[PDB]
Write a protein that binds this ligand. Structure first.
Ligand SMILES: Cc1nnc(Nc2cccc(F)c2)s1
Ligand SMILES: Cc1nnc(Nc2cccc(F)c2)s1
Lengths: 164, 164
């Protein structure tokens, strides 16, 4: 009942896949659940993979930082893919304490209660093309702590204003 | 030769110290080296702890995202604590590929090649007062990978424009 961690980098260092490819593979291989916490979500390829998972019957829960939520909504609209009407996906927002918006500065992807990607990669074109980042691929016991954190966040999340 | 990971949260969840307190304790207990990678560094209390470590003889290496470096410089000036003249501290900047600045979106604190804090907490007042975040405290074998990443980043870092 241990934990295993591999590191991945952007740009890649001593591994065959990029972080984006690894994200898409994790989502592609999802069998049951995807739980995503993300600060900014505008990457169309990743969104497509998630939409496709939900059509296979995977339950998708997404928590987005409230202050950047409009960027995700804009992307979903551009793609003609209204997220409210997709039945296997629920999207809710999370914020911090305001003073200037307090933000949810956490991100991670958890698939099938089995594997977590945790790190500094945000789901935006800029992270594929411009920024340096790193993530961990986590399996084993520590995944349970990410499950618990997701549940904690989900409990403090709100329905986005737009959804009625 | 395993790895141990504890999670900490802001706000705290089932641990006695905040992330900021844990940062200050790690720096206070540093005996040999501090290697810091940080996107934005404006927290004066953390800066003071680092300056104090360097006066005990701890070697301090700091890598900052180039595009936000001026915020650190402003803070060091406000504190009357010119970083160029402090002999045990070297500060260098890192950037990504531009298109809008490409950024170093990585952060971590490594102390004494023994302990790493890795997560989403940036050294700014907003992370103490406004934002939700989480970090890992990592000890054991995985610390060596953070040592290697620090060295990799340091190799691609530049002297800040201001320093002459
Ligand atoms: C990892 C996972 N975290 N919980 C899972 N599912 C779930 C069910 C109800 C509410 C909620 F927020 C999440 S699977
Ligand atoms: C963890 C640590 N990472 N390397 C350490 N020291 C060091 C020495 C020369 C250049 C440099 F970038 C770093 S200690």
């Amino acid at each position: 009942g241990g934990t295993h961690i591999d590191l991945l980098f952007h740009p890649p260092r001593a591994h065959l896949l990029t972080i984006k490819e690894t994200i898409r593979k994790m989502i592609k291989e999802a069998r049951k659940v995807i739980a995503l916490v993300m600060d900014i979500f505008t990457d169309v390829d990743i969104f497509k993979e998630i939409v496709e998972a939900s059509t296979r019957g995977v339950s998708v829960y997404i928590l987005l930082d409230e202050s950047n939520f409009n960027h995700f909504l804009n992307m979903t609209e551009k793609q003609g893919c209204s997220v409210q009407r997709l039945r296997n996906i629920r999207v809710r927002t999370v914020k911090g304490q305001d003073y200037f918006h307090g933000k949810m500065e956490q991100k991670f992807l958890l698939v099938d209660c089995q594997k977590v990607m945790y790190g500094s990669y945000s789901y935006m074109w800029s992270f594929e093309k411009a920024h340096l980042s790193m993530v961990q691929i986590i399996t084993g016991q520590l995944v349970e702590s990410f499950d618990e954190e997701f549940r904690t966040l989900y409990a403090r999340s709100c329905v986005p204003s737009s959804f009625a």
